[PDB]
Amino acid sequence: LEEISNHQGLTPLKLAAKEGKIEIFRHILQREFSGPYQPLSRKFTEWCYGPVRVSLYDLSSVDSWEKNSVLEIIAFHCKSPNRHRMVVLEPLNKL
Amino acid sequence: SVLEMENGYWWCRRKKHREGRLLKVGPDERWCFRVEEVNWAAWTLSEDPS
Amino acid sequence: FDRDRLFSVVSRGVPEELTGLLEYLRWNSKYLTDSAYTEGSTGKTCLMKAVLNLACIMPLLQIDKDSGNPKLLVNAQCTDEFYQGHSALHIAIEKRSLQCVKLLVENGADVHLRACGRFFQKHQGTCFYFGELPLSLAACTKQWDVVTYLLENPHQPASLEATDSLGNTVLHALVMIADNSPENSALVIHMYDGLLQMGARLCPTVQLEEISNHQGLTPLKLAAKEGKIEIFRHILQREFSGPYQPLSRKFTEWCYGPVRVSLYDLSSVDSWEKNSVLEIIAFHCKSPNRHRMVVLEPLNKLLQEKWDRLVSRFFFNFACYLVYMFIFTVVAYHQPSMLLLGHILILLGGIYLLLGQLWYFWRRRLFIWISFMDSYFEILFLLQALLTVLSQVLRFMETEWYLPLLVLSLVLGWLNLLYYTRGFQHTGIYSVMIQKVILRDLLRFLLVYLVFLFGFAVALVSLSRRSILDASLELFKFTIGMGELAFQEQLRFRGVVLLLLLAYVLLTYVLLLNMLIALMSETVNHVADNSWSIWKLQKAISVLEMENGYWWCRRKKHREGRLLKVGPDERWCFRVEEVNWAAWTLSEDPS
Numbered sequence: 001l002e003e004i005s006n007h008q009g010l011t012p013l014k015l016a017a018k019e020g021k022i023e024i025f026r027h028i029l030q031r032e033f034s035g036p037y038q039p040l041s042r043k044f045t046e047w048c049y050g051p052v053r054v055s056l057y058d059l060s061s062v063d064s065w066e067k068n069s070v071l072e073i074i075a076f077h078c079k080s081p082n083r084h085r086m087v088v089l090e091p092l093n094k095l
Numbered sequence: 096s097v098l099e100m101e102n103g104y105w106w107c108r109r110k111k112h113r114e115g116r117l118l119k120v121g122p123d124e125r126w127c128f129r130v131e132e133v134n135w136a137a138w139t140l141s142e143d144p145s
Numbered sequence: 146f147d148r149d150r151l152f153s154v155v156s157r158g159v160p161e162e163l164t165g166l167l168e169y170l171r172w173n174s175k176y177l178t179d180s181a182y183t184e185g186s187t188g189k190t191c192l193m194k195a196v197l198n199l200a201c202i203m204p205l206l207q208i209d210k211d212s213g214n215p216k217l218l219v220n221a222q223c224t225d226e227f228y229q230g231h232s233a234l235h236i237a238i239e240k241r242s243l244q245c246v247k248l249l250v251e252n253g254a255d256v257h258l259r260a261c262g263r264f265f266q267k268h269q270g271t272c273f274y275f276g277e278l279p280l281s282l283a284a285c286t287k288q289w290d291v292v293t294y295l296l297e298n299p300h301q302p303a304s305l306e307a308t309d310s311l312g313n314t315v316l317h318a319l320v321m322i323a324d325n326s327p328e329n330s331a332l333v334i335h336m337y338d339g340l341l342q343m344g345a346r347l348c349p350t351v352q353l354e355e356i357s358n359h360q361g362l363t364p365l366k367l368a369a370k371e372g373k374i375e376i377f378r379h380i381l382q383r384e385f386s387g388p389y390q391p392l393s394r395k396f397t398e399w400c401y402g403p404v405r406v407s408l409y410d411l412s413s414v415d416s417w418e419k420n421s422v423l424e425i426i427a428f429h430c431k432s433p434n435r436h437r438m439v440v441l442e443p444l445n446k447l448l449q450e451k452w453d454r455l456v457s458r459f460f461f462n463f464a465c466y467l468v469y470m471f472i473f474t475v476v477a478y479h480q481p482s483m484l485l486l487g488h489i490l491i492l493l494g495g496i497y498l499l500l501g502q503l504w505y506f507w508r509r510r511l512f513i514w515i516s517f518m519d520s521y522f523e524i525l526f527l528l529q530a531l532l533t534v535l536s537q538v539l540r541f542m543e544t545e546w547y548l549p550l551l552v553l554s555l556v557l558g559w560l561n562l563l564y565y566t567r568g569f570q571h572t573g574i575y576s577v578m579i580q581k582v583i584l585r586d587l588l589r590f591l592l593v594y595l596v597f598l599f600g601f602a603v604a605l606v607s608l609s610r611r612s613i614l615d616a617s618l619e620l621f622k623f624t625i626g627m628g629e630l631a632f633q634e635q636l637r638f639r640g641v642v643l644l645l646l647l648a649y650v651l652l653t654y655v656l657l658l659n660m661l662i663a664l665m666s667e668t669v670n671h672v673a674d675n676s677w678s679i680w681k682l683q684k685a686i687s688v689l690e691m692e693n694g695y696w697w698c699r700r701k702k703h704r705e706g707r708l709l710k711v712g713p714d715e716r717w718c719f720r721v722e723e724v725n726w727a728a729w730t731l732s733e734d735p736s
């Protein structure tokens with residue numbers, strides 16, 4: 001479902017970035033589920049050794065390697081006033 | 096700035112290297128990004144730390 | 146019977162799927178600890194994988210008994226440099242499986258194995274440091290049951306005084322994992338207190354707190370150096386009940402109604418002994434929250450009497466420098482009878498400050514590097530003393546260039562007088578993080594202003610065509626409020642020069658005002674400290690150096706406190722009096 005694009009060629013994740021909907025954008029970007037819905041998640045844990053925990057965020061449409069990525073959409077194709085609050089998200093801030 | 100700068104100069108376009116590592120979540124392979132966090136209150140895909 | 150097959154069976158956890166494996170080892174004369182059956186990349190063995198995929202453990206250890214294995218796999222060690230030293234016992238403790246720990250320990254597992262891998266070091270990247278021993282792992286993971294079992298098991302008790310590769314003990318490990326977080330502070334404080342109580346029961350003749358690592362720091366000293374204020378405060382202000390009374394550091398001398406007097410133990414805190422907590426906090430600590438360390442209840446009071454007892458010496462130093470600077474000014478003003486005496490004092494005064502300042506840098510060199518802003522005035526005094534002596538040297542070795550250096554030393558000598566202003570309140574804003582930020586921007590603003598000043602001056606010269614020096618000076622007069630605005634009618638591009646000059650006026654007003662607005666935001670987004678933590682830190686640094694005495698006359702240090710038998714044990718305690726109207730002793734009567 002997430003790879004379906006509308007007439008503008010934007011996925012639901014990409015559409016949230018362009019329209020400035022930070023609330024749904026953060027939830028989609030940092031999403032995890034249980035065993036039955038494990039392949040439906042975007043955040044995964046690689047290993048956990050006590051307090052130290054490592055997470056793996058899916059850079060499907062986020063990384064700027066592919067054209068019309070989330071980073072390009074947020075920085076240049078977004079007109080919402082709260083553009084700065086988009087990049088401070090946990091996977092975007094680190095990447 | 097970094098998004099424009101990574102595109103390269105006009106006289107020499109630079110190839111863009113994908114950031115991340117291809118991991119089989121499980122199959123399905125996704126280019127994930129490694130982020131490390133420390134939590135002292137809460138008490139996995141791989142088997143051993145790396 | 147195969148390496149791939151053996152690891153697959155242990156993951157499932159069904160011992161019935163592994164039959165005849167022991168017979169296979171006898172046939173091939175191979176052991177489970179051999180490199181053939183290990184993972185090879187990191188030395189991981191079958192037992193290690195079994196604990197990771199948490200019954201098969203007992204038969205797997207049982208079949209080790211049949212084969213003539215000289216080396217026990219229960220004490221196997223990883224071989225990869227990244228993850229070296231990690232054993233199966235470490236897995237059970239990490240997985241929070243008390244039953245697995247009991248099963249492993251009962252079968253001869255060693256409790257003193259060292260996990261000296263790169264992952265277990267205090268790296269700047271991915272790492273986790275819990276000492277280097279299994280006992281430290283349980284302490285840092287909120288496992289009191291595992292700690293209790295590892296301390297009171299008849300099979301192989303774990304010693305509390307065991308040290309890691311750096312000499313860190315169990316108490317040291319709790320210090321290095323502190324992060325001043327509310328969740329982490331409760332973790333370290335609760336376990337540190339519990340281990341001390343268990344330590345008295347297990348080893349009463351061994352004092353845990355006096356054990357020092359390879360750097361020679363006690364756990365109390367280590368907390369001060371590493372900047373862990375949360376555990377530092379708890380250790381410094383510690384009291385217990387009757388059974389653990391000798392294990393406390395804070396005691397009550399007498400209580401008469403609301404008036405209560407407390408006695409804090411100055412064991413490693415008072416500066417009488419070398420490498421004390423006060424010396425460590427002020428000079429050997431690089432943590433940003435150094436000011437919050439001295440405002441603690443025993444440290445805040447103790448540093449006050451040292452300042453009060455030595456305040457006269459501080460003003461005597463101020464008076465001596467003030468008189469010396471007055472002598473310097475008079476001699477310089479009339480440098481071109483008693484003037485011969487004046488030059489002798491200038492040479493003697495410069496050589497006196499130089500030798501005294503050279504002692505300070507000899508005793509300590511890392512302090513200036515780690516914290517430039519803490520002792521930046523030490524550098525300034527060095528330049529003033531060195532230049533003053535050098536300037537008089539050029540007077541004897543006549544080169545006619547001693548005057549510019551003497552004049553430069555005069556203005557800088559008065560600037561060094563601002564150092565003594567730290568002995569008063571002076572209001573302002575007291576912060577070290579802000580001051581570095583403000584200083585950095587002002588220097589950047591000066592560079593931005595100069596290039597704009599230089600850029601416009603060249604533009605003015607070429608368009609009007611003295612040189613750049615006169616034109617740049619004319620533009621700089623605009624800041625001092627002395628600029629020249631006139632329509633020079635004998636210029637071809639008179640309008641362009643006039644418009645360009647007006648552009649500079651509007652440009653420099655924005656630049657100066659922007660810095661004021663930028664400097665205003667720092668003041669607004671600043672929370673004043675009612676205890677004046679920054680000011681107290683500066684006073685604490687000065688008194689510690691001042692009490693050491695001058696270079697020409699070292700002064701004996703008198704210990705601060707009174708020797709009292711707590712009960713026996715005698716500790717040099719510090720008297721602190723407090724008044725409480727809500728709560729309703731060692732001595733018998735008030736005194």
Ligand SMILES: C=C(C)[C@@H]1CCC(C)=C[C@H]1c1c(O)cc(CCCCC)cc1O
Nearest residue numbers: 521573574575579580581582583584585
């Ligand atoms: C307290 C602060 C933040 C003041 C407030 C505004 C002013 C003019 C500058 C700041 C400031 C420094 O940021 C640093 C120093 C001394 C540090 C070394 C200077 C060579 C003094 C100093 O007044």
Ligand SMILES: C=C(C)[C@@H]1CCC(C)=C[C@H]1c1c(O)cc(CCCCC)cc1O
Nearest residue numbers: 584586587588589590591594624657660
């Ligand atoms: C402060 C300001 C805004 C003044 C205003 C006049 C001009 C342009 C110079 C500026 C300036 C620095 O931009 C920087 C310094 C030294 C940096 C540290 C000062 C404690 C002095 C100094 O006069």
